[PDB]
Design an enzyme around this catalytic site. Structure first.
Site, PDB file in Angstrom:
ATOM      1  N   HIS A  65      14.365  35.622  80.268  1.00  0.00           N
ATOM      2  CA  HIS A  65      14.655  37.069  80.201  1.00  0.00           C
ATOM      3  C   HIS A  65      13.550  37.885  80.872  1.00  0.00           C
ATOM      4  CE1 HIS A  65      17.843  35.965  77.526  1.00  0.00           C
ATOM      5  NE2 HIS A  65      16.993  35.434  76.665  1.00  0.00           N
ATOM      6  N   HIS A  95       4.706  41.637  78.340  1.00  0.00           N
ATOM      7  CA  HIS A  95       5.681  41.277  79.361  1.00  0.00           C
ATOM      8  C   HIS A  95       6.088  42.563  80.047  1.00  0.00           C
ATOM      9  CE1 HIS A  95       7.893  42.480  75.761  1.00  0.00           C
ATOM     10  NE2 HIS A  95       8.752  43.039  76.591  1.00  0.00           N
ATOM     11  N   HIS A  97       9.552  44.630  82.298  1.00  0.00           N
ATOM     12  CA  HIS A  97      10.980  44.778  82.585  1.00  0.00           C
ATOM     13  C   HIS A  97      10.897  45.457  83.955  1.00  0.00           C
ATOM     14  CE1 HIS A  97      12.233  44.072  78.387  1.00  0.00           C
ATOM     15  NE2 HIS A  97      11.064  44.604  78.099  1.00  0.00           N
ATOM     16  N   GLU A 107      12.603  50.794  80.999  1.00  0.00           N
ATOM     17  CA  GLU A 107      13.545  50.894  79.896  1.00  0.00           C
ATOM     18  C   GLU A 107      13.515  52.335  79.417  1.00  0.00           C
ATOM     19  OE1 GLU A 107      12.711  47.302  77.291  1.00  0.00           O
ATOM     20  OE2 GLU A 107      14.566  46.816  78.372  1.00  0.00           O
ATOM     21  N   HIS A 120       5.102  46.120  78.408  1.00  0.00           N
ATOM     22  CA  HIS A 120       5.171  46.196  76.959  1.00  0.00           C
ATOM     23  C   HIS A 120       4.103  45.289  76.349  1.00  0.00           C
ATOM     24  CE1 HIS A 120       9.643  47.503  77.009  1.00  0.00           C
ATOM     25  NE2 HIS A 120       8.814  48.531  77.252  1.00  0.00           N
ATOM     26  N   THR A 199      13.836  45.965  72.310  1.00  0.00           N
ATOM     27  CA  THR A 199      14.834  46.335  73.309  1.00  0.00           C
ATOM     28  C   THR A 199      15.709  45.177  73.784  1.00  0.00           C
ATOM     29  OG1 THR A 199      13.408  45.995  75.209  1.00  0.00           O
ATOM     30  CG2 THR A 199      13.319  48.160  74.100  1.00  0.00           C
ATOM     31  N   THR A 200      15.523  43.987  73.206  1.00  0.00           N
ATOM     32  CA  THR A 200      16.399  42.853  73.523  1.00  0.00           C
ATOM     33  C   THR A 200      16.827  42.252  72.191  1.00  0.00           C
ATOM     34  OG1 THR A 200      14.793  41.013  73.452  1.00  0.00           O
ATOM     35  CG2 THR A 200      14.995  42.211  75.540  1.00  0.00           C
TER      36      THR A 200
HETATM   37  C1  FC4 Z   1      10.832  36.139  69.459  1.00  0.00           C
HETATM   38  C2  FC4 Z   1      11.498  37.506  69.294  1.00  0.00           C
HETATM   39  S1  FC4 Z   1      11.703  37.956  67.532  1.00  0.00           S
HETATM   40  C3  FC4 Z   1      10.880  36.682  66.613  1.00  0.00           C
HETATM   41  N1  FC4 Z   1       9.815  36.066  67.065  1.00  0.00           N
HETATM   42  C4  FC4 Z   1       9.235  35.104  66.281  1.00  0.00           C
HETATM   43  C5  FC4 Z   1       8.064  34.452  66.912  1.00  0.00           C
HETATM   44  C6  FC4 Z   1       6.799  34.522  66.337  1.00  0.00           C
HETATM   45  C7  FC4 Z   1       5.684  33.997  66.981  1.00  0.00           C
HETATM   46  C8  FC4 Z   1       5.835  33.397  68.215  1.00  0.00           C
HETATM   47 CL1  FC4 Z   1       4.456  32.752  69.036  1.00  0.00          CL
HETATM   48  C9  FC4 Z   1       7.078  33.312  68.808  1.00  0.00           C
HETATM   49  C10 FC4 Z   1       8.186  33.837  68.153  1.00  0.00           C
HETATM   50  C11 FC4 Z   1       9.710  34.770  65.050  1.00  0.00           C
HETATM   51  C12 FC4 Z   1       8.989  33.796  64.309  1.00  0.00           C
HETATM   52  N2  FC4 Z   1       8.405  33.009  63.706  1.00  0.00           N
HETATM   53  C13 FC4 Z   1      10.880  35.446  64.549  1.00  0.00           C
HETATM   54  O1  FC4 Z   1      11.394  35.240  63.440  1.00  0.00           O
HETATM   55  N3  FC4 Z   1      11.415  36.394  65.397  1.00  0.00           N
HETATM   56  C14 FC4 Z   1      10.689  38.611  69.976  1.00  0.00           C
HETATM   57  O2  FC4 Z   1       9.513  38.776  69.741  1.00  0.00           O
HETATM   58  N4  FC4 Z   1      11.400  39.355  70.848  1.00  0.00           N
HETATM   59  C15 FC4 Z   1      11.080  40.623  71.373  1.00  0.00           C
HETATM   60  C16 FC4 Z   1       9.790  41.141  71.424  1.00  0.00           C
HETATM   61  C17 FC4 Z   1       9.555  42.362  72.025  1.00  0.00           C
HETATM   62  C18 FC4 Z   1      10.601  43.077  72.573  1.00  0.00           C
HETATM   63  S2  FC4 Z   1      10.294  44.616  73.366  1.00  0.00           S
HETATM   64  N5  FC4 Z   1      11.048  44.655  74.773  1.00  0.00           N
HETATM   65  O3  FC4 Z   1      10.899  45.597  72.516  1.00  0.00           O
HETATM   66  O4  FC4 Z   1       8.886  44.750  73.574  1.00  0.00           O
HETATM   67  C19 FC4 Z   1      11.884  42.572  72.521  1.00  0.00           C
HETATM   68  C20 FC4 Z   1      12.128  41.350  71.927  1.00  0.00           C
HETATM   69 ZN    ZN Z   2       9.950  44.629  76.427  1.00  0.00          ZN
END
Ligand code: FC4
Ligand code: ZN
Length: 261
Positions: A65, A95, A97, A107, A120, A199-200
């Protein structure tokens, strides 16, 4: 997420996310358009505190992504405090976008203006113990967003640009130690802030958004390299990783606050 099939294509893009993630039509979704004339200055907002001197980057990963530069967040090494925040938030990853064209990619938008990309820097509230617990809380995350416009090169970004060749496709990662995130910050820390979401997918409403007013400039060559990455895994048909941004969502019952007049 072994069964997640969302993406940014015509058949699995932002307009489709609500089917698997109903919170997509929630009350505090991100990103949003920042109407500068409607945002209100909040003199009670404290200056932002960005302490990245002891940051420890570890790896860079193409996750299908975007690409994430990950940090050691097992101790208070790189933290964000102050501003609208109470408590300490640890940097876990950053990261970007970006778009297929310089005229789009961010975004958040400012008075409907779209920037070439958006950085971000993701932080989680240490009072929740770990990132996984934090994303389940309304004040679990603080994401510092920084707009990128195309112009002069950003020296501090080149190390990132140069390593992209090694993580071209989904699932590839590379050691990425000793990277200093301070080199990605603009001069001013003036910002807008509002309560929002990831946002994802899973689009969890756990984020206090802090978006800097001053964008940083990157060169055409630097953003061009971003556009050479792949959404696909190795050995699969090439799909360029571009336009991995979610469009602005309804502000609904929220007010954006500004740290400056
Ligand atoms: C991995 C996913 S959510 C998530 N992430 C984790 C997680 C926690 C630690 C690590 Cl190293 C990797 C994944 C866990 C756990 N344990 C969990 O339950 N959920 C995430 O962090 N996505 C994410 C982050 C920023 C944004 S943004 N664009 O809003 O900044 C969008 C999506
Ligand atoms: Zn982001």
């Amino acid at each position: 997420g072994m069964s997640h099939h969302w993406g940014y294509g015509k058949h699995n893009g932002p307009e489709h996310w609500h089917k698997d993630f109903p919170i997509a039509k929630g009350e505090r979704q991100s990103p949003v358009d920042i109407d500068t004339h409607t945002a209100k200055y909040d003199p009670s907002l404290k200056p932002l505190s960005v302490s990245y001197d002891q940051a420890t980057s570890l790896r860079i990963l193409n996750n299908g992504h975007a690409f994430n530069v990950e940090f050691d967040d097992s101790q208070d090494k790189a933290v964000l405090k102050g501003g609208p925040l109470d408590g300490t938030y640890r940097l876990i990853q950053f990261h970007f976008h970006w778009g297929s064209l310089d005229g789009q990619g961010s975004e958040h938008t400012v008075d409907k203006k779209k920037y070439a990309a958006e950085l971000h820097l993701v932080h989680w509230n240490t009072k929740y113990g770990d990132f996984g617990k934090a994303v389940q809380q309304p004040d679990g995350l603080a994401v510092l967003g920084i707009f990128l416009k195309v112009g002069s090169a950003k020296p501090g970004l080149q190390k990132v640009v140069d390593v992209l060749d090694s993580i071209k496709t989904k699932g590839k990662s590379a050691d990425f130690t000793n990277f200093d995130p301070r080199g990605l910050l603009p001069e001013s820390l003036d910002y807008w802030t509002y309560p929002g979401s990831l946002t994802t997918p899973p689009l969890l409403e756990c984020v206090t958004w802090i978006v800097l007013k001053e964008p940083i400039s990157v060169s055409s060559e630097q953003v061009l390299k971003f556009r050479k990455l792949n959404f696909n895994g190795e050995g699969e048909p090439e799909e360029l990783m571009v336009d991995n941004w979610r469009p602005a969502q309804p502000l609904k019952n929220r007010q954006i606050k500004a740290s400056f007049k």
